[PDB]
Amino acid sequence: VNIVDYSDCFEGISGGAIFCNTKNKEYNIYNKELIETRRSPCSTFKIVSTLIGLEKGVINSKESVMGYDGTDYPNKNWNKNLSLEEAFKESCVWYYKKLINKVDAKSVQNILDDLKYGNCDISEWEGDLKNGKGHLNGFWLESSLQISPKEQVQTMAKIFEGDTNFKKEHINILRDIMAIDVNDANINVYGKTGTGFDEKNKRVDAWFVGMLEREGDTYYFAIKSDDSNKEITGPKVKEIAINIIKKYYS
């Protein structure tokens, strides 16, 4: 366990980072207190919900569709019968809500328990209804389910090192759709952003979680901001993570 200083890359935004190489158990941590604090995963839960849907047969391939019903949405790309790969890349809420609502709660509870997915609390299944967004809500979006950045990294490692019961075929679909292009052919980066606002603490939950492969070494990582500035989003935190990877992990 190495405590490190990545503040240069955070460019004044409050947050922390953890990178872990499980082959030589090296654990690089910036802002340990934040890295150990559980927060709503927000859209980073799509990593796990994709695997749940694949395992239960609700979806089967990166082509699979959820039967778009014509409902009007402000994001252009949500207004079509999009595939798993597009719904993941566009963070299409209706697709992933329809997906998860086809799965019984006990199956979800047992998968989260097996993964040690934070507090594994799905009690508020329908999410944070007081925000007025109705069916665009769920237990994983600023609601009952909470996970720390360290736990995210531990979950990512278990999945992608092949230590869960999920099918290898399904792991590879998720690998495929999380691949990121960082304009550096010598590292393979995979990840997913998440964005939420913690109304109780008046701080953002801005995430970028994933993994990095560079010549034999694999690093599992989670970068997290808790800034009070509402302009700090998951996409912004992904920028920060990419700066860290290029400066320290190239």
Q: Catalog residues that contact ligand NXL under the rule CB under 6 A.
A: 42-43, 91, 93, 141, 193-196, 233-235
By beta-carbon proximity to ligand NXL, the closer residue of 10 and 88 is 88
In the bound complex, what is the minimum distance in angstroms from residue 40's beta carbon to ligand NXL? Answer: 9
In the bound complex, what is the minimum distance in angstroms from residue 108's beta carbon to ligand NXL? Answer: 18
In the bound complex, what is the minimum distance in angstroms from residue 78's beta carbon to ligand NXL? Answer: 10
By beta-carbon proximity to ligand NXL, the closer residue of 53 and 234 is 234
SS (H, E, C) the chain: CEECCCHHHHCCCCEEEEEEECCCCEEEEECHHHHCCCECCHHHHHHHHHHHHHHHCCCCCCCCCCCCCCCCCCCHHHCCCCCHHHHHHHCCHHHHHHHHCCCCHHHHHHHHHHHCCCCCCCCCCCCCHHHCCCCCCCCCCCCCCCECHHHHHHHHHHHHCCCCCCCHHHHHHHHHHHEECCCCCCCEEEEEEEEEEECCCCEEEEEEEEEEEECCEEEEEEEEECCCCCCCCHHHHHHHHHHHHHHHCC
By beta-carbon proximity to ligand NXL, the closer residue of 29 and 192 is 192
In the bound complex, what is the minimum distance in angstroms from residue 74's beta carbon to ligand NXL? Answer: 11
In the bound complex, what is the minimum distance in angstroms from residue 99's beta carbon to ligand NXL? Answer: 14
Q: Phi, psi (5° rounding) for residue 3?
A: -85, 130
By beta-carbon proximity to ligand NXL, the closer residue of 20 and 141 is 141
By beta-carbon proximity to ligand NXL, the closer residue of 29 and 145 is 145
By beta-carbon proximity to ligand NXL, the closer residue of 193 and 225 is 193
In the bound complex, what is the minimum distance in angstroms from residue 22's beta carbon to ligand NXL? Answer: 26
Q: Which residue is nearest to ligand NXL (CB)?
A: 43
